[PDB]
C-alpha cells in the first residue's frame, strides 16, 4: 500500500499484529519492553523489542517516491535506583531484523558489539532516549542524559541534553518530511517542558524500500522499566520534486 496508518491508544493483552522479540510483553495495558519481576520491579540484563507486523513502504525506486511519516508515542521509565539504564528507542529497519547477539545494555538491543559504530555494517535509523552515559562502558555517549538520532551507529549523529523523570510520561512526535529530508523529533513532559532535535537524512541511502518499525529497550547492569504506553503511526508515499 502507498499509505498505512494504525493507532494503539493503549495495549490490551490480546494482540495480533505485534512481533515480540526478547523479553517484551504486555502488562497492565502497556508494553513492557524490558523484563520485570512478579512485583513489577525492573531487573538487570534484559532486552526486548516490538515491531508492527505489516511492512511499511518507505520509498519506491520505480516511481521515485519517498514516504512522509509520523510516529507519535508516549512512554515512562521507573526505577528503585536513580541511575536507571539503559534507554528506549524508536527504530526503523529491514523487515527481518532480530535482536543482534550481545546487544544488551548500552547497545539498546539495536547493534552488535563488533559493528556498533560501523556505519557501513548497519541499516537502521532510530530515535533513542538514553539515560546512561558512563564513559567507561558507553564511550560513544556525550556525558549526560540525552535524546539522540542514530543513523547506522550507536554514536548519535545529533543529540540534545534531556532530563530523565522517574515515573513521568514523555510524549513524543517523530516526523520525516521527504521534501526537505528533515527527521524532526519533539518530546514533551506534561508540564510543557520541551526537547527538540533534528537532522537531515536521505532514507533511500540507508534503508531498503520496505521496512518494519517498532521499539527496542535494554537494561544491563543498571535497570529501569521501559513502558510503552501508546503509539500511532502513519506513512504516505509522496512524489518528491
Ligand X SMILES: CO[C@H]1O[C@H](CO[C@H]2O[C@H](CO)[C@@H](O)[C@H](O)[C@@H]2O)[C@@H](O)[C@H](O)[C@@H]1O
Residues 108 and 87: beta-carbon distance below 8 Å: yes
Build a one-symbol-per-residue string for 115-134: x at contacts with Mn ion by CB under 5 A, - elsewhere. Answer: ---------------x----
14: contact with its own copies by CB under 8 A: yes
Query: Of residues 129-168, which lie at the interface with ligand X (CB under 6 A)?
Result: 132, 134, 136-138
Nearest Cα residue to 90 out of 221, 179, 200, 183: 183
Build a one-symbol-per-residue string for 84-113: x at contacts with ligand X by CB under 6 A, - elsewhere. Answer: -xx-----------------xxx-------
What residues contact 86, with CB distance under 8 A and at least 6 apart?
Answer: 105, 106, 108, 130, 131, 132, 217, 218, 219, 220, 222
Q: Return the residue of 23, 130, 150, 229 that touches Ca ion, per CB under 5 A.
A: 130
Our CB check for Ca ion shows the closer of 141 and 229 to be 141
Out of Mn ion, ligand X, its own copies, none, what residue 12 binds, judged by CB under 5 to 8 A for its kind, is its own copies
Return the C-alpha cell found at 61.
525506486
Number of residues assigned to the chain? 241
Q: Return the residue of 76, 88, 141, 203 that touches Ca ion, per CB under 5 A.
A: 141
Nearest Cα residue to 174 out of 212, 148, 155, 192: 148
67: contact with ligand X by CB under 6 A: no
CA distance 185 to 220: 26
CA distance 144 to 195: 14
Nearest Cα residue to 106 out of 142, 137, 84: 137
Our CB check for ligand X shows the closer of 45 and 68 to be 45
Please state the closest distance from residue 9 (CB atom) to its own copies, in A.
6
Nearest Cα residue to 132 out of 141, 122, 123, 121: 141
Our CB check for ligand X shows the closer of 104 and 178 to be 104
Our CB check for its own copies shows the closer of 5 and 139 to be 5
Query: Of residues 97-116, which lie at the interface with Ca ion (CB under 5 A)?
Result: 106
Residues that bind Mn ion (CB under 5 A): 130, 141, 148
Residues that bind ligand X (CB under 6 A): 85-86, 104-106, 132, 134, 136-138, 219-222
Amino acid at each position: 500500500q502507498d499509505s498505512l496508518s494504525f493507532g494503539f491508544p493503549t495495549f490490551p493483552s490480546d494482540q495480533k499484529n505485534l512481533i515480540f522479540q526478547g523479553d517484551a510483553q504486555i502488562k497492565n495495558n502497556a508494553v513492557q519492553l524490558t523484563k520485570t519481576d512478579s512485583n513489577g520491579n525492573p531487573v538487570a540484563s534484559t532486552v526486548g523489542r516490538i515491531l508492527f507486523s505489516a511492512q511499511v513502504h518507505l520509498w519506491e525506486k520505480s516511481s521515485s517516491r519517498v514516504a512522509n511519516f509520523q510516529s507519535q508515542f508516549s512512554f515512562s521509565l521507573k526505577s528503585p535506583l536513580s541511575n536507571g539504564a539503559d534507554g528506549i528507542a524508536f527504530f526503523i529497519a529491514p523487515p527481518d531484523t532480530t535482536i543482534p547477539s550481545g546487544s544488551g545494555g548500552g547497545l539498546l538491543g539495536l547493534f552488535a558489539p563488533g559493528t556498533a559504530q560501523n556505519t557501513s555494517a548497519n541499516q537502521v535509523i532510530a530515535v533513542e532516549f538514553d539515560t546512561f552515559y558512563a564513559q567507561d562502558s558507553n564511550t560513544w555517549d556525550p556525558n549526560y542524559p540525552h535524546i539522540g538520532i542514530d543513523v547506522n551507529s550507536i554514536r548519535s549523529v545529533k543529540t540534545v541534553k534531556w532530563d530523565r523523570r522517574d515515573g513521568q510520561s514523555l510524549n513524543v512526535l517523530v516526523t520525516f518530511n521527504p521534501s526537505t529530508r528533515n527527521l524532526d523529533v519533539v518530546a514533551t513532559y506534561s508540564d510543557g517542558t520541551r526537547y527538540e532535535v533534528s537532522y537531515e537524512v536521505d532514507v533511500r541511502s540507508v534503508l531498503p524500500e520496505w521496512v518494519r518499525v517498532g521499539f527496542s529497550a535494554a537494561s544491563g547492569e543498571q535497570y529501569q522499566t521501559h513502558t510503552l504506553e501508546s503509539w500511532s503511526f502513519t506513512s504516505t508515499l509522496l512524489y518528491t520534486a
